[PDB]
A paper describes a structure:
MCC–eisosomes are relatively stable, and have been implicated in sensing and responding to plasma membrane stress: various stimuli, including hypo-osmotic shock, heat shock and mechanical pressure, cause eisosomes to flatten and release sequestered proteins to affect signalling or transport functions. Here we isolated near-native eisosomes as helical tubules made up of a lattice of Pil1/Lsp1 bound to plasma membrane lipids, and solved their structures by helical reconstruction.
Three-dimensional variability analysis of the native-source eisosomes revealed a dynamic stretching of the Pil1/Lsp1 lattice that affects the sequestration of these lipids. To characterize the relationship between the Nt stretching and the changes in the lipid density, we extracted ten sets of non-overlapping particles along this variability dimension for further refinement, which allowed us to compare the most compact and most stretched lattice classes. This suggests that the flexibility we observe arises from the protein lattice stretching to accommodate larger diameters of tubules. Although the most compressed protein lattice class retained the pattern of membrane voids beneath the AH, indicating sterol binding, this pattern was gradually lost in the intermediate classes and was blurred in the most stretched protein lattice class, despite its slightly higher resolution. In our native-source structures, we see that Pil1 lattice stretching is correlated with a mobilization of PI(4,5)P2 and PS and a loss of the sterol patterning within the cytoplasmic leaflet, which implies an increased mobility of all of the lipids within the MCC–eisosome.
Numbering used by the authors:
A (entry chain A), B (entry chain B): 1 to 271
């Protein structure tokens, strides 16, 4: 988060924000529950009511992550349709305009397919989170039994300190305690391992997607440079278009670079 | 698109796809209309029925782009909630685990706010597309009148070649034609200018967002390195955690780098 020490819900402008004023807030921000509907909210609340207490939060996280994946795939499909129909509109235009919008449509198609691949990786990470949820929520009943048996032992001791069940219940409490402390140890180990692996995978997918999208954007801007933005004076003829070969090579190079990209090929250097 | 010349709906694996097998397709791909509901589809169809013919496609593009923006803001809010509640789950864990998941939550919060900024830029680009739609759809009725008047002139000439209305209608046809050819010229000019500017803005926002997300991912992986993934043997104690200062400096550096990022500071070099 970028907030400086102030009560303001506004952050100090960065270098990009200093370069130009930020655009006004989106006009599509309507008034609603802030999420669109209620069925997924009911699912989330059910995850927050019925599940075991100590696993309830992680089950809710898994459900919300599934919602995020659903929304991401839906918006990827919608972006694909938008690119297709944008190029459809650009078909009946100037030949230069038609070619430029067609190539932009292909680039957005690549962006959509890369989004789909990142979505598959994101679902793999979500499955890992589901696995850690499962193991930890199945290790919870050990401590549940420990708490129940210690409460029963306290109640029996208060009611009848000389009851014969005291010794056997004490052995059982010891046994659940040996079952439980070291189970906590194993749970911590597996939680650390699974969390580290899943988040490393997720961040590798994130950086790969970001770098591929950045390369696509750079190639698209270089190809936009090809577009002739010089206006033609009223009443004049249309100059001939000869950018087929240049955009031809540009899209060829974009595909070649996308094939060539590797995890080590990432040029992002954190400091 | 990455498809090689084959009937396969499968693309040759890239270097990243060669490094490891791709994950299986997402398990959340349910059976439905492929989009979730019907109200937005009705809106899109109304955009594809009632509007002027030559502006109908661009109006549909604007509507679909609004749908994309709505979905993007919804998924950004859901990702924000997911990060918050993930860190909420990580609160009651190991102190190292609590700190690492808290910092990851902050990083995903930054990702969400950057998504919101990119969404604002994307809506600015959508507004530019709306503007070009408006001007071009308002220039369409000139050609509509030209076609109507030429049809009327042909019908009148066939019905009565010596009708007195022939000369005045011919002058009006000339006048609409002088109104229309050069209007086509101006429309081509304004379309080129608006499209180039809007797509340059969109691609600049895209590359900025991608680079910021890539820096966030790199810093997050470097911070995940801080996590102690070494398992502890059963029955042993918990080693003391001392990573507060290291993650302290890591998040400080991440914020500093995010402030320092400029458009020229982008390190992506298309070839
Ligand atoms: O004032 P009203 O009667 O409620 O209608 C609004 C506005 O006048 C436009 O018709 C429309 O924007 P466009 O001109 O771009 O179609 C907008 O839709 P929007 O919010 O989805 O943009 C409507 O909400
Ligand atoms: O086959 P169904 O009837 O569609 O139900 C699916 C599955 O059987 C589980 O109930 C659930 O996973 P869990 O066992 O972990 O709850 C999953 O949710 P998910 O995709 O969010 O994991 C559901 O989609």
């Amino acid at each position: 988060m970028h907030r400086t020490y102030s009560l303001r819900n506004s952050r100090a402008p960065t270098a990009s924000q200093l370069q130009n004023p930020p655009p006004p807030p989106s006009t599509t921000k309507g008034r609603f529950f802030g999420k669109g509907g209620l069925a997924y909210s009911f699912r989330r609340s059910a995850a927050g009511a019925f599940g075991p207490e100590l696993s309830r939060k992680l089950s809710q996280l898994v459900k919300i992550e599934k919602n995020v994946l659903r929304s991401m795939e839906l918006t990827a499909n919608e972006r694909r349709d938008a690119a297709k129909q944008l190029s459809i509109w650009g078909l009946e235009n100037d030949d230069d305009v038609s070619d430029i919008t067609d190539k932009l449509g292909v680039l957005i198609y690549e962006v959509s397919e890369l989004d789909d691949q990142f979505i598959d990786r994101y679902d793999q990470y979500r499955l890992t989170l589901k696995s850690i949820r499962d193991i930890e929520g199945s290790v919870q009943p050990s401590r549940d039994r420990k708490d129940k048996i210690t409460d029963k032992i306290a109640y029996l001791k208060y009611k009848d300190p000389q009851s014969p069940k005291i010794e056997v219940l004490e052995q059982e409490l010891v046994r659940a305690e040996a079952e439980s402390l070291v189970a906590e140890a194993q749970l911590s180990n597996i939680t650390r391992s699974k969390l580290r692996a899943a988040f490393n995978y997720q961040f590798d997918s994130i950086i790969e997607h970001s770098e591929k999208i950045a390369l696509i954007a750079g190639y698209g801007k270089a190809l936009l440079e090809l577009l002739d933005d010089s206006p033609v004076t009223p009443g004049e003829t249309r100059p001939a278009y000869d950018g087929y070969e240049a955009s031809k090579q540009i899209i060829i190079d974009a595909e070649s670079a996308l094939n060539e990209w590797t995890l080590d090929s990432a040029q992002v250097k954190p400091t």
